[PDB]
Scaffold this active site. Structure first.
Site, short mmCIF file in Angstrom:
data_model
loop_
_atom_site.label_atom_id
_atom_site.label_comp_id
_atom_site.label_asym_id
_atom_site.label_seq_id
_atom_site.Cartn_x
_atom_site.Cartn_y
_atom_site.Cartn_z
N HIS A 1 44.73 31.57 49.59
CA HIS A 1 44.08 32.76 49.04
C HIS A 1 45.04 33.95 49.09
O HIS A 1 45.20 34.70 48.11
CB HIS A 1 42.78 33.01 49.83
CG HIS A 1 42.02 34.25 49.42
ND1 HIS A 1 40.79 34.21 48.79
CD2 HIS A 1 42.31 35.57 49.57
CE1 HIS A 1 40.37 35.45 48.56
NE2 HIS A 1 41.27 36.30 49.03
N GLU A 2 45.69 34.14 50.24
CA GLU A 2 46.59 35.28 50.40
C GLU A 2 47.82 35.17 49.51
O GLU A 2 48.19 36.13 48.83
CB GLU A 2 47.00 35.47 51.87
CG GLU A 2 45.86 35.62 52.88
CD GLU A 2 44.78 36.56 52.46
OE1 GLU A 2 45.07 37.52 51.74
OE2 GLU A 2 43.59 36.33 52.84
N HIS B 1 47.14 36.07 45.94
CA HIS B 1 47.16 37.49 45.59
C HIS B 1 48.54 37.92 45.10
O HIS B 1 48.66 38.71 44.16
CB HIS B 1 46.72 38.35 46.78
CG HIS B 1 45.23 38.45 46.97
ND1 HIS B 1 44.39 38.89 45.97
CD2 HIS B 1 44.44 38.16 48.02
CE1 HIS B 1 43.15 38.89 46.42
NE2 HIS B 1 43.14 38.46 47.67
N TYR C 1 42.54 46.04 41.70
CA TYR C 1 41.66 45.56 42.77
C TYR C 1 40.40 46.42 42.90
O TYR C 1 40.12 47.03 43.93
CB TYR C 1 42.42 45.48 44.08
CG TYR C 1 41.83 44.54 45.10
CD1 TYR C 1 41.75 43.18 44.84
CD2 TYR C 1 41.43 44.99 46.34
CE1 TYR C 1 41.26 42.30 45.78
CE2 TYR C 1 40.94 44.12 47.29
CZ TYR C 1 40.85 42.77 47.02
OH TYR C 1 40.36 41.93 47.99
N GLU D 1 39.83 38.41 43.12
CA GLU D 1 39.31 37.69 44.28
C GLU D 1 39.00 36.25 43.94
O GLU D 1 39.34 35.33 44.71
CB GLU D 1 38.06 38.40 44.82
CG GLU D 1 38.38 39.41 45.88
CD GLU D 1 39.14 38.77 47.01
OE1 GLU D 1 38.64 37.78 47.58
OE2 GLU D 1 40.28 39.24 47.30
N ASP E 1 33.26 47.93 49.08
CA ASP E 1 34.14 46.78 48.86
C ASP E 1 34.87 46.90 47.51
O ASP E 1 34.97 45.94 46.74
CB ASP E 1 33.32 45.49 48.96
CG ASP E 1 34.14 44.22 48.83
OD1 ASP E 1 35.31 44.17 49.30
OD2 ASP E 1 33.57 43.24 48.30
N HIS F 1 34.63 41.22 46.65
CA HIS F 1 34.35 39.98 47.38
C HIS F 1 32.92 39.50 47.19
O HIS F 1 32.53 38.48 47.79
CB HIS F 1 34.60 40.16 48.89
CG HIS F 1 36.02 40.47 49.24
ND1 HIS F 1 36.50 41.75 49.40
CD2 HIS F 1 37.07 39.64 49.45
CE1 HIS F 1 37.79 41.70 49.69
NE2 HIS F 1 38.16 40.43 49.72
C1 8L5 Z 1 39.95 34.58 52.74
C2 8L5 Z 1 39.44 35.59 53.76
C3 8L5 Z 1 39.39 34.95 55.15
C4 8L5 Z 1 40.30 36.84 53.78
C5 8L5 Z 1 40.17 37.72 52.52
N1 8L5 Z 1 41.06 38.87 52.65
P1 8L5 Z 1 41.73 39.56 51.29
O1 8L5 Z 1 40.74 39.38 50.16
O2 8L5 Z 1 43.08 39.01 50.91
C6 8L5 Z 1 41.91 41.33 51.72
N2 8L5 Z 1 42.83 41.94 50.81
C7 8L5 Z 1 42.77 43.29 50.43
O3 8L5 Z 1 41.97 44.05 50.85
O4 8L5 Z 1 43.77 43.56 49.51
C8 8L5 Z 1 43.97 44.90 49.15
C9 8L5 Z 1 45.23 45.44 49.79
C10 8L5 Z 1 46.29 45.89 48.99
C11 8L5 Z 1 47.44 46.39 49.57
C12 8L5 Z 1 47.56 46.45 50.94
C13 8L5 Z 1 46.52 45.99 51.73
C14 8L5 Z 1 45.37 45.49 51.17
C15 8L5 Z 1 38.71 38.15 52.41
O5 8L5 Z 1 37.89 37.56 51.78
N3 8L5 Z 1 38.37 39.28 53.19
C16 8L5 Z 1 37.03 39.80 53.30
N4 8L5 Z 1 36.29 39.08 54.26
ZN ZN Z 2 41.37 38.28 48.64
#
Ligand code: 8L5
Ligand code: ZN
Ligand code: CA
Ligand code: CA
Ligand code: CA
Ligand code: CA
Length: 316
Positions: free
Chosen positions: A142-143, A146, A157, A166, A226, A231
């Site tokens: 997932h990461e 991105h 985003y 997402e 959010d 999400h």
């Molecule tokens: C698969 C999960 C365990 C983790 C996931 N985390 P994510 O969706 O990659 C957060 N990214 C973000 O905010 O990017 C925005 C961003 C942009 C630049 C710098 C920092 C942040 C999620 O669903 N998190 C919510 N539970």
């Molecule tokens: Zn994500």
């Protein structure tokens, strides 16, 4: 670092033993030279300065509890690299073999993971909501996805483009989990979420409503939390993707499944050829229809099933 490629051994977050690609130069570093221009894993040492220190180990054995999140971040980044290269002929996130960097032990009690514009970052969790998040192959993929999105479609985003962003990360996170073929499912984060509760996950693609997320456009979130529900409203697209692959009848609309590989081909092509930073859900439908047409033909079952799946979730 300059050195020679080596193979270490260690244990991941869930206690499983795996070999990892390392580099020897006085210490053994979590630096895999076998993939692109390298995969590099760093210790953030419970702080928030990034990236921290390139992970160094005296003996090339990674069995300490502190090592486990690093082992999995490093190994699962390699699996994800292999998926994109072998399945989609894509060399790293930029298509040019950019070095892939991850930091583990980020902050204290940090119940999340993210791409920061330049690298992946994993918390250890608080031990109750999450254990160290790199233990989930779907999370790692997932990461890294991105980064792929940011280099390709560039989906902003926020609001619908952000929910597509997402969903793309959940879709490819899941397809990587199936590629590795260890306890694969259509759930997100189950291997690291809530160690005290069995059978749950952060999100479900097969039934987003199990965790409160919408499974139809008429149920979309329209507020500001959010980033406009990125999400949350991802559930609408995750459900469509699940239906394309697996089939089903949803709100009375029947979808003939075409399988995971074709789902991945259609969405990869949509992401890399048709989506733009501001695409909305309707524009995603059109991109997926066009992608399936390119790959399988206008009169194909694949095209028909893409249309049925978006109909089933209320996206015209
Ligand atoms: C698969 C999960 C365990 C983790 C996931 N985390 P994510 O969706 O990659 C957060 N990214 C973000 O905010 O990017 C925005 C961003 C942009 C630049 C710098 C920092 C942040 C999620 O669903 N998190 C919510 N539970
Ligand atoms: Zn994500
Ligand atoms: Ca060691
Ligand atoms: Ca699983
Ligand atoms: Ca999963
Ligand atoms: Ca759990």
């Amino acid at each position: 670092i300059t050195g020679t490629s080596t193979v270490g051994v260690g244990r991941g977050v869930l206690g499983d033993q795996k070999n990892i690609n390392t580099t020897y130069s006085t210490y053994y570093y979590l630096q895999d030279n076998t993939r692109g221009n390298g995969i590099f894993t760093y210790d953030a040492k419970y702080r928030t300065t990034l990236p921290g220190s390139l992970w160094a180990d005296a003996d090339n054995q990674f069995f300490a509890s502190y090592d486990a999140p690093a082992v999995d971040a490093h190994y699962y980044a390699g699996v994800t690299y292999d998926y994109y290269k072998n399945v989609h002929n894509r060399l790293s996130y930029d298509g040019n073999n950019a070095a892939i960097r991850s930091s583990v032990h980020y902050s204290q009690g940090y119940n999340n993971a993210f791409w920061n514009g330049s690298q992946m970052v994993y918390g250890d969790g608080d031990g109750q909501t999450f254990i160290p998040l790199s233990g989930g192959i779907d999370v790692v993929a997932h990461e890294l996805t991105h980064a792929v999105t940011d280099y390709t479609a560039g989906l902003i985003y926020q609001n619908e483009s952000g929910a597509i962003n997402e969903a793309i990360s959940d879709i490819f996170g899941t397809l990587v989990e199936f590629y590795a073929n260890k306890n694969p499912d259509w759930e997100i984060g189950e291997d690291v979420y809530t160690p005290g509760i069995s059978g749950d996950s952060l999100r479900s693609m097969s039934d987003p409503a199990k965790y409160g997320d919408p499974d139809h456009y008429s149920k979309r979130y329209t507020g500001t939390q959010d980033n406009g529900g990125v999400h949350i409203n991802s559930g609408i697209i995750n459900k469509a993707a699940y239906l394309i692959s697996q089939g089903g009848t949803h709100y009375g609309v029947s979808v003939v499944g075409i399988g995971r590989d074709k789902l991945g081909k259609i969405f990869y092509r949509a992401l890399t050829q048709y989506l733009t930073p501001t695409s909305n859900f309707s524009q995603l439908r059109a991109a997926a229809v066009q992608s399936a047409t390119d790959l399988y033909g206008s009169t194909s079952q694949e095209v028909a099933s893409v249309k049925q799946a978006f109909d089933a979730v209320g996206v015209k």
